[PDB]
Design a protein around this ligand. Structure first.
Ligand SMILES: *Cc1c(COP(=O)(O)O)cnc(C)c1O
Ligand SMILES: *Cc1c(COP(=O)(O)O)cnc(C)c1O
Ligand SMILES: *Cc1c(COP(=O)(O)O)cnc(C)c1O
Ligand SMILES: *Cc1c(COP(=O)(O)O)cnc(C)c1O
Lengths: 459, 458, 459, 458
């Protein structure tokens, strides 16, 4: 009854009684030959155990939970390539309907039924498309004026997210950075104007600054730019990087005027996979009207009577995230989105208030307007403490959390902060678990008799 | 009696509810919620009335993976790749996939961690290759005191549209080499005629979408070497191998098209085409670290692996990395070879059956990728009442998408039809398709009057 | 239209837009009222994220992987109560067949088709049943001889597992402990005999000592005990605690005489859920013959129909683990068990050898006979190191592992050691991941300028 | 043709294989392996020919949970509870379950973390309560200079077998108070007659398995208070509340049976009976920490919770802890009350329909747990050809298990039948049972000769 080939991968092989599971996974070259599907499944899957669990990843802004029905719907669409719009025209129209809904969430004045916007893989592509459109609009203007157009720049807070550095590098466009101070913890419009000139293609205020959790004041920026543009004729626009805030502000702060209600906001981008409540792979960019999307970048095709704009950096891509976005819009509606974001914001405020009660800590802001916030060590506490927030990050990782510590951008670079992001699926109960682990970690770190490596590096 | 039955309570039947008497939202988010079952049906039911992916014969992109790969990728739906500090095992796995691809392409780079990058498809992978070529050229010309404000690149008129996107989004001039019956792929002398001091690269294509053919990369490399020696322009190749990058290593290992060639400095591929992974995967590799400009890129060490950080996207699904690594382990070289062999053999089979039909003639007698094109015999077309556009419509009535289109410049009088054979399209399915084609021909030959497209051709 | 009850838990509620998920989980009192199944499911499930993943728990000996068919089979039996033998007689017979197979793996000479043994929830119950049986055989013996029987004792290594302390405390039986030394790293028979007297009910050698991974030499103990019993007439028996080794030795070391082949081995216990390859909830105890199981320990019940006779501490219990064990016996057979245990042992040997090459480390034993082993810091390295194995445990926890550090039992209590247990489902690829994390952790700890708290506590 | 088809290769059909022409192993492990599908069928197919759990009316143990509890528990199949350092959240969850149960029983303990312990069932929980009682008594008698080598405990003859196990495995004398028709539950004055200086506790039972009744704990408490005041023996109560512990708090909150009583120092319950969790759960609580001897127990601080480390088992499934905590949150007090109300109402319904049948008379008019027993009317039994054993056999022919058995001491001439109504046994299923009982009666009344069990009674 001996099975000659049991260790070699036949129908009787046990995965963990096989020769293949005594061998390392391939690092440099494809294996010469195959294995059983069960063996290969375990070899790939087992490597993903030893890292952060997504629901305990508190560094990320990107969705780690959807309900079972959205998840089934997206799984069922795993083999649907969005870009095959002639073959899958219902998904092309569904994409156009999502774009319409987003543009109207942002109060677009565009009268066309099919709003001018584009699907993206995240805010990276959406921001780049907005920035490229702004660059081409500026080039066209300056050429018509007989002015040089070879030295473009854009203006942004030092609180920028790295995709704006990617944009600057990949297109060779100069990024001008407005520093953060304790007195100006968000983009100050007067400071932004100091960096504007005839070569500025746009200013980029951020709704949901990743470093701080705050919102740049888009209305204040719009007012300053209106006076500046009237005086110079430079006609510098705004592109709003609303990666998180674009799905927070419409529901919880409808009266905050930050979007297409503003004269100079010509385009807005968002991460559908952050607070749009869809699994990874979704962003959106909208323009205020077709006249702000250059023809040099774009065309539109009619699918089943819908006019669908064709602009993007990617081509073939999963369609699942479109179904997921449209499901969330129908399943939740405005009320449902409001209640989910309310929960996330209330839990963030709850953690913020509990952090403030702890002896080592002080919050950077009293104002929690997105479901995330940052804190640092009280300066008097930090001076005689043996530990830093990097040490607290390490302690929390021992229980499976990722809670990141980092230094703030320019002029606040002496501030080591820690950030918590509250996403859908992070509950009050999970917040209580986190806070209990933070209190326990503090108590252990306060037993140290000698300074840690990062504490010594701060001297 | 349940007062709230139609309004969406726990007893509601989806299709006895008020919501399923209402249209789906076109312009604005609905004011309020519905039950998950109602929303699930409202979204899912809209996807019925379009092509079934396994019958989509226009696409090159994977429509089937086995149950284990599918389960593995489904389980990773909530993993954001870019969180590499949080998910360092996936970051390392990404690096191992890049190593394996670079070695499939015979990279001479000695570093254990090969210079390459994850992409969402060949679109991003091609654009990264082109931007790197543009920046390498800018730096060269700046050092020589030469202008660098008017870049161009050279490509066949058989280009795939991502190169037009690249041209538009970076404002780089695309110079196109036309196709003829005598030169059905990129001709090197004609390509060199379009090269000058401002050319950043030449782009041969392995798996031209319009024709199914391969540009001769080795022939281009030979021509570019003599031209670069004569001019000093130092023009490189970037190979767009969107399909061919996962065909040639297994079925044509001795064809010298990759990093074995002196001037091939970068190569891109669609992992979601013949890399056998569901939508959302491409790769770009450089021949060495010296060809990826520092201005574009940096690298971070995760668990001892050096992972290059270059890309157009940021947050993105990680599932396709697991899927690629699964295919590499599950199939190996032999398994990839056997799957691509099956796809190519079925393409050749259909190609041979098409040639036997009276209306048809194949564009090429040689099938080197699992796809091919044919057109109507000229004498048949002249007296026929129908065109290949009419055949496309007839086939769609049975659920197929088989596209008809005109070929690019100088061949634009040729209306062709294309079949792509992917994993999961079997000999049995090929027989169904061929049977539907014969029936469709038989119906179209009964027409007494020309169709609209037949009339538009006169 | 707006749903007035959306936050309160109706059919439209989103789990994470509900009032319930702004509230803590219940600590003291049952909630007054219900919630939706989806809310309750998340509230309980989400609390389990922030702890060790079972497949990365390298402290446990207990099975964390079975294949999909065993898992489905056991899931399908979740509502089957084993003890209802009149209602579920086929599972009762299946339990008996498992007992037969285990007794025959251990070379029972018992001729009855139905072997003398009992189901247990683990080695805890199995050991207690073996110990109670030894105690009752000894009481009856001493009563017949007109000798006292009120002060029983048993003899065991200080490497005992805590269930023997439970046995000592819950029955008020004296435990006599034989210390470990570097010269006698397992139970020395001569020293064990020195603790024996007329009140000793048994000696307990261990196959798979939890502290060390080693096997007590049962054959040496049997030989010494035979001479001791011939001299004293005390007739002290052996009960083998084979919690791990009972499913290793028969397959990988068939010629090692440790089981019912030995004259004085009257009972043996094992954890079916350790290297028996079944999910948690399984142990077995076998006796060499019916004459060694006292009649006082069998019981009969009639209130579940017909007549059910049993031996055990528990009563109602899941039956799933019986199905799982019988599946493994049929699915793997002798060859399959041998190949699975071979993989586990070979991977343990591989890690053991790589640990030995690292500058900080020295292995406790050169002999790896169970799929687990321990190491400690080289004494010369430890003296000048700023860190201890407790710090390495903490570093590994940051990547999801549990690799436990602890002090060895008596006379070796100055030795802080670390243990790795290799179970089915822990592959060579996972070993490489662990070893890479160990090397990285060593390199970080070697950067410390000051001693850690545990390093200071050692001086 | 596949040469190895019968031998177990990738093409083998389970029921076209050599292995399914062979017997399952009885004595020895098979020499070699088989495919998972064959092994799965070999084990699964043996479980068909026995009682379906939802038709098992003998058992008190849960046979139904909802789909979410079931999924949650299945997902925890590989979690070993005892690894509390590795799984500290489940350790804390266990402690919260103990808190909730202790508070359901009106514990006066002030500590946040109540003194209690997880068990596999009431067997382990009862044994822990008895051992604790035995050790408290040993310590007192030693301090008084009195003997402590001959312990005993007092219980009704309606005890469940675990108390016999406790008696035999610890060699502790069990003193039994018999049942009579005049004293259908434990009579306290009769219990006190068997108490002396060596009695470690008296064990009243809430949910007597034989009868379905509750011993009067408050009446016992009152009698013990006077006896302890007279003797100084200070004999305590341990309540075996295996079933009643999850019935009385919801349906009879004002019945004083628990830690509200002075002498009730510990209580045990089966979480897998009317705690509504699948097999593998019991709980024991003590009235305070001072009643759990240190010799049995220590406590460890996991994440700021005080968890007591006392038990007979060690490694064990953690799934049942999640199931218990899910039920507490999913149902709450109201949900438990409504579920137990349903079970009790259905038991009362069956009880009333049984009483209307000519052959039958109920043992008690009072149904306080969701179960009851009946027997044959004495005048009917005398001229009947059949017994309740014959009715058990007839009902088994339709898949039911409804057990017939003789009652304990002094009622051992009474053959009775028991029905237990658990969650998942509805009014509709009760109607099916009652229809089968009536059909069985009509068939048995056609007998012309006595059955073997009927002859055995005369
Ligand atoms: C997330 C983020 C980005 C990047 O968006 P992705 O969705 O990760 O591509 C850009 N800007 C801000 C403010 C962000 O938070
Ligand atoms: C598919 C294709 C592309 C575009 O690649 P995507 O994977 O769809 O982004 C580019 N070039 C060629 C030759 C292609 O076939
Ligand atoms: C596992 C272990 C025990 C405890 O057995 P469980 O299966 O956890 O109940 C007892 N003795 C030894 C040697 C062990 O390894
Ligand atoms: C069921 C029962 C027991 C045994 O409990 P298990 O949960 O089966 O271990 C003990 N006493 C009573 C009163 C019971 O009903």
């Amino acid at each position: 009854m001996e099975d000659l080939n049991f260790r070699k991968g036949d129908a009787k092989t046990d995965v963990f009684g096989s020769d293949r599971m005594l061998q390392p996974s391939p690092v440099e070259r494809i294996p010469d030959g195959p294995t059983t599907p069960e063996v290969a499944y375990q070899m790939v899957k087992d490597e993903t155990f030893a890292q952060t669990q997504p629901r305990l990843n508190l560094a990320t802004f990107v969705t780690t939970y959807m309900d079972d029905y959205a998840t089934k719907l997206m799984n069922e669409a795993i083999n649907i390539n969005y870009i095959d719009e002639t073959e899958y025209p219902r998904i092309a129209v569904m994409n156009g309907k999502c774009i319409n809904i987003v543009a109207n969430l942002w109060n677009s004045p565009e009268k066309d039924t099919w709003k001018t916007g584009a699907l993206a893989i995240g805010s990276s592509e959406a921001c780049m498309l907005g920035g490229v459109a702004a660059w081409l609009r500026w080039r066209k203007k300056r050429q018509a004026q007989g002015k040089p157009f070879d030295k473009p720049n854009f203006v942004i807070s030092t609180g920028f997210q790295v995709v704006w550095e990617k944009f600057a590098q990949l297109w060779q466009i100069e990024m001008r950075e407005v520093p953060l101070t304790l007195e100006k913890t968000t983009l100050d419009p007067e400071e932004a104007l100091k960096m504007c000139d005839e070569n500025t293609i746009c200013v980029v205020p951020i709704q949901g600054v990743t470093w701080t959790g705050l919102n740049d004041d888009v209305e204040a920026l719009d007012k300053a730019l209106d006076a500046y543009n009237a005086k110079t004729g430079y006609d510098i626009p705004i592109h709003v990087d609303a990666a998180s805030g674009g799905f927070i502000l419409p529901f919880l702060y409808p009266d905050t005027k930050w979007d297409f209600r503003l004269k100079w906001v010509l385009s807005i981008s968002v991460s559908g996979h952050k607070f749009g409540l869809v699994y990874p792979g979704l962003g959106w960019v909208c323009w205020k009207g077709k006249e702000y999307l250059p023809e040099e970048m774009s065309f539109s095709v009619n699918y089943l009577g819908a006019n669908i704009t064709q602009v993007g950096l990617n081509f073939s891509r999963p369609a699942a995230q479109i179904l997921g976005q449209y499901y969330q819009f129908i399943r939740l509606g405005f009320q449902g989105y409001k209640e989910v974001q309310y929960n996330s914001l209330q839990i963030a405020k709850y953690i913020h208030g509990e952090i403030a009660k702890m002896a080592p800590f002080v919050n950077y802001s009293e104002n929690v307007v997105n479901p995330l916030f940052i804190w640092y060590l009280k300066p008097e506490y930090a001076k005689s403490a043996k530990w830093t927030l990097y040490d607290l990050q390490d302690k929390l990782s021992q229980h499976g959390w990722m809670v990141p510590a980092y230094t703030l951008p320019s002029k606040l670079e002496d501030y080591v902060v820690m950030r918590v992001v509250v996403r859908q699926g992070f509950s009050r109960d999970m917040a209580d678990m986190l806070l209990g682990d933070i209190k326990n970690a503090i108590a252990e770190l306060e037993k140290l008799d000698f300074p840690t490596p990062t504490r010594m590096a701060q001297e």
